[PDB]
Every structure is written in C-alpha cells, then in structure tokens.
Design a protein around this nucleic acid. Structure first.
Ligand SMILES: Cc1cn([C@H]2C[C@H](N=[N+]=[N-])[C@@H](COP(=O)(O)OP(=O)(O)OP(=O)(O)O)O2)c(=O)[nH]c1=O
Ligand SMILES: [Ca+2]
Lengths: 412, 554
DNA sequence: TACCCCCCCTTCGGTGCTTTGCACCGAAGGGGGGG
C-alpha cells in the first residue's frame, strides 16, 4: 500500500524485445523455485503472450555465495529508461569514495521488493522461463514491485534509502555511502576491524527497516595504474630497435613528445635482424628523454560525466591481462594490469569474466558508471560460457573486437 | 453466446483499422467442401452471421489435409496480420526424442479441431469478417465473424499454446510424476505407472481436458508403440525418424537439389556422417529455381554414399539422466565436421554436423572450436547440461593454440581420442628472430587508378627482386611481396613487413582460405622449418623497409 | 497465393577497420521438419 511513481520510456522508443537464451538444468531449477516463492509473496505474477516485450533471465551465485540468486538482463530496458535515472531521479557521485582505504559492497536488492511498481510500467518487465528440451512452452512473468537489477529501481527507492541511512550517516558523519543499483557501497578510513563492525551496525540498522543482506571488500587506494614501459638491454639487436621504434611510434599518439629520429638513424641500413647495434650518443639520449616522458601524466585528461566510458582489454598470455579506461581515444582515464586471476593457466573465458567484473567495479567506485567493453573474443565463444562465471548483480554493455598484437604497447 | 475458457485481450497497431480486401476467385470444387463444414460451425457457436454493419473483408481458400481425404480451412489474413499487434511467441523451440527419458508406458493424443476450441476475444471478433462463395455468382453468401481462433491468423498459435498450459497447469500439479510434452495440440504423455493405472490417469486428463471443452478423438489417440510423434517413430527403448524419400529424378533442377539438401540435413540428425558440401556447391549464385543444372563428379559421389547410409536402418536411444553425456567429433575434410552424442558406447542419442565456413581465412582448430560451441548450445537445449568431449586433437596441440592466440578461447572438459585424421597446426611462427637465417625486407604498392603494382624485397645478403603486377590492389601486393620472400628463401627465413593487413591474416595460422594467393602462402609456410614474421611502421626511414619502399614505387 | 516455431546453405548489403579494399555479420529467401 504505497504510492507508485510513474515511469515513461525515452521519447519515441519501444520496450525491450529480447529473446531468451538456453539455460542449464541447475539454473532452470533455481529460477523456478525463486519464481514460485516470489509469486506466493505477490512479488511477481504470471502473464500471457499478449505482452510483446521480453527480457532475458538467468541465475548466478555471488562470489562464495553457494545460494542461487536471480538475475535479469535489463540492459535493453535500461537503455530505454535512460531519461529516468540520469536526468530526473539520479544520484550524485561521492568523489571521496575512491579515496577510502576500505569499501564494502552489500546486496540491498531484497528491499526493492517492498515498494510496488507503476502499473503502466509492469508491461516492460516481462521475462520468460524456458524449459529443458521444450517439454513445456515458456512460462512468462512480470514484476509487481521494484525489480532487482533495473536502473529505475535505486532511483525510486532513493528517498526511502536516504531516510534509512540518515541516522547512521549522522551517527558516523565522515563515512561515505554510495548506492549503485542492487549494491550499496560503504567506505571508511577506519581500521579493518572498526570498518567491518560499522557494517554489521549498518546491517542491523537496515534490518529494523525490513531488509536482509545475503560482504565484498575493496581497497581503492591500493589500486595501481599501469604505465607504458621501455625495455632494458645491455646490447640492442636490429629487431629489438625495430620493435622498439614501432612501439614508440604507436605511443606517440598519447605522449606527443616521443621522438624517433635518432633511433631511426640506427636502422638506416639493410641489416640482419639478429645483428647487434651499439647505440649512439643521441640515440641513448633520445631514449633517455623518451623514458622520462612516459613517466608523466597524459596532458589534458579528465572525466566528462556526459560521455560514455570505454574499456579495452588485451590478453597478454601466461595469466596476465591489461586494460585501459578512456572516453576519448588516447586520453586514458586509467590503465592497469591483472594477473593470477581465477582460472589462470586453464580457462580464458573465466579470467575475462573476472576482469570485466573487476574493471566495472573500479569504474563504479571512481566515476559511478559502467563502461562499454571492447572484448578480445569471438561472439559465439562469449555468449555461450559467460553466464557460468558471472558473479555480479549488474551486466555492462559490450562489443567484440579482433585486433592482433602488431605491437605490445601495454605489457612488455 | 456461451463461454468456455478464459480469453486473451487483443488489439490492433494503434491508429489503424481492419481488413478490407476482396475475395479470391475460388473454384467451385473447393466451395463444395467449403460451405459444408462452414455451415456446421454456426451450430456450435464457432462462427456467426453478421449484418453489413461489419465493413471488413478477407480472402479464403482451402487445402487438403496431408495423408487424408478431409479438407482444412485457411483464411488469408496477410493484410490483417500487417496491421495486427505484435506478440511474443511462447514456442521457444522443438522437443527432440533424444531428450526423452525412458518411460514405462506412453500415450500420444491429438486435439481435434485445436484452434477452434479456444474462444477469441469479444471486442476483436468483428475484424474476422469474410464472405463465403457460391456455385454461381448470383447468390451473395453469408458474411461471418469468427468466435474462435482462425487458421491463418498470426496470433492463433501463440494464444493456443499459452491457453493450453493454463488448462494443463492444475492437472500437472495434481500428477507431478506425469511427463506431458506439450507442443501445440500434440500431447506426449508418459509415466512410470503400470499400464493399467497409466491409461486410467490418461482418461482423467481426457476428462480434465473435456471439462474445458477440449476433444480427445480416439483416431488421433495412440495407445501402442511405435508412436508417431514429431515425425519420429518412438519405440519402448529406441526411436528413429520416419522414413526419408530421396527423389529419383534423372535430370535435376535447382528446386530438386534444394529438396535433396533439406532431406539430408533432416537425415543428418540420426544417420551418421551425412555430407552436403558438394551438393550445395551447385546452388551458388543461380538465378532460376526451375533452371536445370548438371551434377559434378564430386556431387555424384556424395549423393551415392549418402544413399548408402540411408540404405541400412538406424536408430537412437533415450536419455538416462544418471549417466554422463559424451560427444565425440570427427573431421570430414573441406571444413566439414560430424558428431555423435551418446551415453553408452556405440548406442547414439543423436548425431549432427557442423559445416559452416565462417570467414575468409580459417584453420581446423578455429572450426573445431566453432563446432564444440554449436554442440554445447544444442546440448544445453535438449538435456540442460554440457557433454564431456572426445576430440581428435592432441592435448598439447590445443594447449599451444589457446595460450598463444591473442583472443580468449576455451573448450570444456575433454579428452584426446586418437581417431585420425587428427587436427593440428600446420606451421608455427617463431617468437624470436632466427640466427643465421636470411632476413627479407618486403614491400608492395599498387596504383588506385592503374590497378598496376609492384612487389619485391631486399635482404642483408644483397639479394633482391621486384615483380610487375596486373589488376591488383594495395593489399594483394603486400601479400604477394611475402609470397616472393617465402619462395626465394631457405628453410629458415626472417621476413619484415610494414603491412598490418597481411601480418594479421598470417599470424592467425590459417590452413584454408578463399583467396588463392593466401593458399600459396600457406603452402610455402608448411614447407619451411622456421619462419619469423615482424612488423615495422612505414616511411620512418627504418631498415630495409625504406629501401624496398623505394624500389616498388618506381 | 495463410499462420507460428526450430535447423542448414546461399546471397546481399550494411558496418568499421584491415580502409575506400576487405572482412564480418545479420537479415532473408531457398529448402527440410513440427503443429
Ligand atoms: C497442419 C497445420 C496445422 N495448423 C494449426 C491449426 C490447427 N488448429 N486448428 N484448428 C492446429 C492443429 O492441427 P491438427 O492437429 O493437425 O488438426 P486439427 O485442425 O486440430 O483437427 P483434428 O484433425 O481433429 O485433430 O495446428 C495450421 O494453422 N496450418 C497447418 O497446415
Ligand atoms: Ca488437431
């Protein structure tokens, strides 16, 4: 018995019509059970094919969760509600969140089931549960309350949320709280022991307002940027200097001070690749000044909230992976490298999934946005396995790229 | 009127009105069988006479029910469908017999007049208006509006399938151990009940379907194996496709090959090793469906051995959820692959084939990964799990491919099977330059207007070449320059290019290509013992990349 | 001379980077199959 906030799609736009992809048995079982009890609690109710809209649905387990969690792929709906959660009911971002020594993520998505949903908008939350071997045609549902994983849900509940938080935001004044969809990000400079206690205080402070929390520990200060680095050799071959000049030539689109003339001079002849080349004075000096320019920050790089974030990832092999987050090309807001992730030396898809989740989490903490990913993988490979390794309650936008490593720019 | 079951609301596309199009000049032979059952509908409340207050009109015809003397009625709603609202079909796929768990007793029953047992929506009925012809053009014929779902509308199937489920839902909850495969009106019902109790429960459900006014005719009903279901013959412990007739035509058209190819794709699901490659090579770029085209000595060989598989009868088995799933793949050559999914050795659940050629340049490892993914998707559909794979590729062959490849790639749990021909990488680019090997700086260039170009190289040992090229492109010359350096070099060679285009193609280690120039490069690379490819940017005064950039521009 | 679903195989035309060539992909019309 609560007032329902009206929601309308972006001007001149139709709801999501997205096919449902095949699900494994253990995921269909987990969903039917999750969907049954959610129905006897009125959170959802069955619908029919008169509804032209559909959204894909599947299940996950959070990291170490062991309990299934329902997850809907609202990317197509969210792109068509974009007016709502950005212009109208959006959230300011606490730029100080990235500065806290520890940050904890809590799943508050179970509270969105409290508030009901606008009736005219429930036609767009339609999702279908498939059946193994098409034993039964598709069982359709739609949401009566705020759905877990819709971007309008945290904006509507924000008024209720900031009230529940206000006693604890006052009881602990300098502790930063941010909310991105089904997750609540809370960070402090307190010691680890003090921090985890204030979380349990925030858990009970949420319990008496009617919410459970089925915590992830980050360290934003710890994260380290990755810079472009030049090798160290006591002797340089022709192929070495050729590779080196190609890399510097590619790096010149970011740091304009890069010079190649004195190193290009060393190549002037037509020599065998393995032949040793001693460095001249000016080459050794042009190399020295170049190594310094790559120490500097990129001139004129800053974040624009009106622009989309882009994230490129490159597979370096032997477990290493590199990534760069940018808005405009060659203006990189951040660069980094991951190593020895879960599935290293055995499964590529799992590592790539783990990388996307880590990168997205960093973007949420720093800028409160999820970037669009350029993924080094084939479409069919990724669309097949990616659900098996997904442990997060959000799903970023992505595209697939094929860019052979003509030059190893980001990792030696 | 009277009201059997819960209706489904329908609309038109907003701001649009109903179907006004004139009837077909139907022959009086169909009109005889037409108005016969047509007048019988109005007695049951299925159709209604309407006044000219209803200003819509839609054509009508009829076709014979296949394998029957009866006639079936179809109303052309193509223009109504264009202006009718969009649905979302609840039919997500087709059941496969290889997904059926073994049941002690099984019953198959069709619903007599399936669409006609479901009430349409009250307010929408007016739009069904159509007129019934006569023997002469003197009598006008009554205009009718449908009170139920018409055969030929675009919303009829989706509404029927969804309504059927709400009807079967209460029974399914009362009898959890009964397996009802619901596909349109065709019902496969099976149980582990003893045959006496099984038929008793069948009757309760026929009564339960009857309680909602759904007929279960005995003639459609089948009580004994082998059941005809989804074009299969289901036996107590085995199944097979209903027999497949291959056309015997002496001279083939394009519509003949199409019928042949489709029949074979259908057969490939159980009859192992069906190949379509050389029969489909005949249909490429052909204009007329009626055009006559001859059979190559390749496609003649393929149709002969494909008929020999169909000669001996084959059968599949059923699913035992306790035992593991196994999928083994063989390489058939020319980008063709077949597979068998089984549980007990030599007793197949189903077969299939992946022959898709994806991209201009590929290799056997890429195509094997594409086939593993096709099987995984197919298997998660039918059994909801991923099979264990037996693959004709050495464990170290794969380990080298995915570790070195610049893109992420993976294959689930699998083991090596020694069945040749084995999948391999036919060459390997060195990670580091070769000491003592001649170093070839190559380059190429073409004139955008002239289509004339040159491709040549320089080496450290003084060697040289330039070749004039006719009707070529900048890309082809960059590949051609590499072909030369491979031809004129020893067993171990270092090759330095400034072409991003060519290095990308070669570094992915292809063994097949649409481009014949590439196949010749592949052919040379297999011959070599050590190849090292490198890249430098052009016009930087680099190495011999500047010197051969001069020769090929002159 | 209708409708809805799944599959393979071919063409074609749009898309973006490998660049005004070449490669990729998805929609679509051919067929098989189910009701
Ligand atoms: C074969 C066929 C079926 N359908 C639909 C429409 C039909 N519903 N009705 N009426 C269903 C089922 O057709 P069907 O099961 O084959 O026979 P039916 O019309 O239901 O009467 P019956 O012989 O006494 O069983 O499929 C179609 O639209 N076009 C076709 O060519
Ligand atoms: Ca029927």
């Amino acid at each position: 018995p609560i007032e329902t906030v009206p929601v309308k799609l972006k001007p001149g736009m139709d709801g999501p019509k997205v096919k449902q992809w095949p699900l494994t048995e253990e995921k269909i079982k987990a969903l039917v059970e999750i969907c049954t009890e959610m129905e006897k609690e009125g959170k959802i109710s069955k619908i029919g094919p008169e509804n032209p809209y559909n959204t894909p649905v599947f299940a996950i387990k959070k990291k170490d969760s062991t309990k299934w969690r329902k997850l809907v792929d609202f990317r197509e709906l969210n792109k068509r509600t974009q007016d709502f959660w950005e212009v109208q009911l959006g959230i300011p971002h606490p730029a100080g969140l990235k500065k806290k020594k520890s940050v904890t993520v809590l799943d508050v998505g179970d509270a969105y089931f409290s508030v009901p949903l606008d009736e005219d908008f429930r036609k767009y939350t339609a999702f279908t549960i498939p059946s193994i071997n098409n034993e039964t045609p598709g069982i359709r549902y739609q949401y009566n309350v705020l759905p877990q994983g819709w971007k309008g849900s945290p904006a509507i509940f924000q008024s209720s949320m900031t009230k529940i938080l206000e006693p604890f935001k006052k009881q602990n004044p300098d502790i930063v709280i941010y909310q991105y969809m089904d997750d609540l990000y809370v960070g402090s400079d307190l010691e680890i022991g003090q921090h985890r206690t204030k979380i349990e205080e925030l858990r009970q402070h949420l319990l008496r307002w009617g919410l459970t929390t089925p915590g992830y520990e980050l360290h934003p200060d710890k994260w380290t940027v990755q810079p472009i680095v030049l090798p160290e050799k006591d002797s340089w071959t022709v192929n070495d200097i050729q590779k080196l000049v190609g890399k510097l030539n590619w790096a010149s689109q970011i740091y304009p001070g890069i010079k190649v003339r004195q190193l290009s001079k060393l190549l002037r002849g037509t020599k065998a690749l393995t032949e040793v080349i001693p460095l001249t004075e000016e080459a050794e000096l042009e190399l020295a000044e170049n190594r310094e320019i790559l120490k500097e920050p990129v001139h004129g790089v800053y974040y624009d909230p009106s622009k989309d974030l882009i994230a490129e990832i490159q597979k370096q092999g032997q477990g290493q992976w590199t990534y760069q987050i940018y808005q405009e090309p060659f203006k990189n807001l951040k660069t980094g490298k991951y190593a020895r992730m879960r599935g290293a030396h055995t499964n590529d898809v799992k590592q790539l999934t783990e990388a996307v989740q880590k990168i997205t989490t960093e973007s949420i903490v720093i800028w409160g946005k999820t970037p669009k990913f350029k993924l080094p993988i084939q479409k069919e490979t990724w669309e097949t396995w990616w659900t098996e390794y997904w442990q997060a309650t959000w799903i970023p936008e992505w595209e697939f790229v094929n860019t052979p490593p003509l030059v190893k720019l980001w990792y030696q | 009127p009277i009201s059997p079951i819960e209706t489904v609301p329908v609309k038109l596309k907003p701001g649009m009105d109903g179907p006004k199009v004139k009837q077909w000049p139907l022959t009086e032979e169909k009109i005889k069988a037409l108005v016969e059952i047509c007048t019988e509908m109005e007695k049951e409340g299925k159709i209604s006479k309407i006044g000219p207050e209803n200003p819509y009109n839609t054509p009508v015809f009829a076709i014979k029910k296949k394998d029957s003397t009866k006639w079936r009625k179809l109303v052309d709603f193509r223009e109504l469908n264009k202006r009718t609202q969009d649905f979302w079909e609840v039919q997500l796929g087709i059941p496969h017999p290889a997904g059926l768990k073994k049941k002690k007793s099984v019953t198959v029953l069709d619903v007599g007049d399936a669409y006609f047992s479901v009430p349409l929506d009250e307010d929408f009925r007016k739009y069904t208006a159509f007129t019934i012809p006569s023997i002469n053009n003197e009598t006008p014929g009554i205009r009718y509006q449908y009170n139920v779902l018409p055969q030929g509308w675009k919303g009829s199937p989706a509404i029927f399938q969804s309504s059927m489920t709400k009807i079967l839902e209460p029974f399914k909850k009362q009898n959890p151990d009964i397996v009802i495969y619901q596909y349109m009106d065709d019902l496969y019902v099976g149980s582990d009940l003893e045959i006496g109790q099984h038929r008793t429960k069948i009757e309760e459900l026929r009564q339960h379907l009857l309680r909602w006014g759904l007929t279960t005719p005995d003639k459609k009903h089948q009580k004994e194996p082998p059941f005809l279901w989804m074009g299969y013959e289901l036996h107590p412990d085995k199944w097979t496709v209903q027999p497949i007739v291959l056309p015997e035509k002496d001279s083939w058209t394009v519509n003949d090959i199409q019928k042949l190819v489709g029949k074979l794709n259908w057969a490939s699901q159980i009859y192992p090793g069906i190949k379509v490659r050389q029969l489909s090579k005949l249909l490429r770029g052909t204009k007329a469906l009626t055009e006559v085209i001859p059979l190559t000595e390749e496609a003649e060989l393929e149709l002969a051995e494909n008929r020999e598989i169909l000669k001996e009868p084959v059968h599949g088995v059923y699913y035992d959820p306790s035992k593991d799933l196994i999928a083994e793949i063989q390489k058939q050559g020319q980008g063709q692959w077949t597979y068998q999914i089984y549980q007990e050795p030599f007793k197949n659940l189903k077969t299939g084939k992946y022959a898709r050629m994806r991209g201009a340049h590929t290799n056997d490892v890429k195509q094997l990964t594409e086939a593993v993914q096709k099987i995984t998707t197919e298997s998660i559909v039918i059994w909801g799990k991923t099979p264990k794979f037996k693959l004709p590729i050495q464990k170290e062959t794969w380990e080298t491919w995915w570790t070195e490849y610049w893109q992420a790639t993976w294959i689930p749990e699998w083991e090596f099977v020694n069945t040749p021909p084995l999948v391999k990488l036919w060459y390997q680019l060195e990670k580091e330059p070769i000491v003592g090997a001649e170093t070839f700086y190559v380059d190429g260039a073409a004139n955008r207007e002239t289509k004339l170009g040159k491709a040549g190289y320089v080496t450290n040992k003084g060697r040289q070449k330039v070749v004039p090229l006719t009707n070529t492109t900048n890309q082809k010359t960059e590949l051609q320059a590499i072909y030369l350096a491979l031809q004129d070099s020893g067993l171990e060679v270092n090759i330095v290019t400034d072409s991003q285009y060519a290095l990308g193609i070669i570094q992915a280690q292809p063994d097949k290509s649409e481009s014949e120039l590439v196949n010749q490069i592949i052919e040379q690379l297999i011959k070599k013992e050590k190849v090292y490819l490198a890249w430098v940017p052009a016009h930087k005064g680099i190495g011999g990349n500047e010197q051969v950039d001069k020769l090929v521009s002159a």
